[PDB]
């Protein structure tokens, strides 16, 4: 269930740190942020590969393009792009 997955996601952010209070604070924050937000990926990937090349990371850019083409040959890819850097 979504409620379990957000619970597990909040616990992963508590690795390396009362515990129940912190878990409830992080859960509340996650839901409050999700609700505030509720109220093409290929082009973003091309822009990211270009940004890697201008930083001198051309091998990482070529590898990113290859891995994305392998996956094509969408919501998860859009999440990874929105979390880039």
């Amino acid at each position: 269930s979504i409620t379990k997955l957000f619970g597990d996601l909040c616990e992963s952010h508590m690795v390396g740190f009362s515990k129940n209070r912190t878990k409830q604070t992080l859960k509340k924050l996650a839901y409050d942020t999700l609700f505030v937000h509720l109220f093409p990926v290929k082009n973003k990937i091309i822009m990211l590969s270009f940004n890697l090349r201008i930083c001198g990371m051309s091998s990482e850019a070529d590898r990113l393009e290859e891995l994305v083409e392998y996956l094509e040959q969408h919501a998860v890819l859009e999440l990874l792009v929105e979390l880039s850097g």
Partner: protein, 93 residues
């Protein structure tokens, strides 16, 4: 840069943003690999190459008109990279 390059692809191909994705990635790659000009950045050397091209084509009247337009472009002071624009126009002639 990137949005302008996507718009350039859409316009030349007569296609929407979704249909130009391959040509846009090609364009980004070519621009990213060629960050520095291999030629000297001299506006005068381009203006001389443009005038020589009109002479080569037997279009001496158009070479005189180009010299007037180049003087007007210089006096306006609006553009910073005048050399690069003239070089692009010469490269596409």
């Amino acid at each position: 840069p990137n949005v302008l390059l996507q718009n350039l692809c859409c316009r030349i191909l007569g296609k929407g943003e979704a249909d130009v994705a391959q040509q846009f990635q090609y364009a980004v790659r070519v621009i990213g690999s060629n960050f520095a000009p291999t030629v000297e950045r001299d506006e005068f050397l381009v203006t001389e190459k443009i005038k020589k091209e009109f002479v080569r084509q037997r279009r001496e009247a158009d070479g005189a008109l180009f010299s007037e337009l180049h003087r007007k472009l210089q006096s306006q002071g609006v553009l910073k990279n005048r050399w690069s624009i003239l070089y692009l126009l010469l490269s596409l002639s």
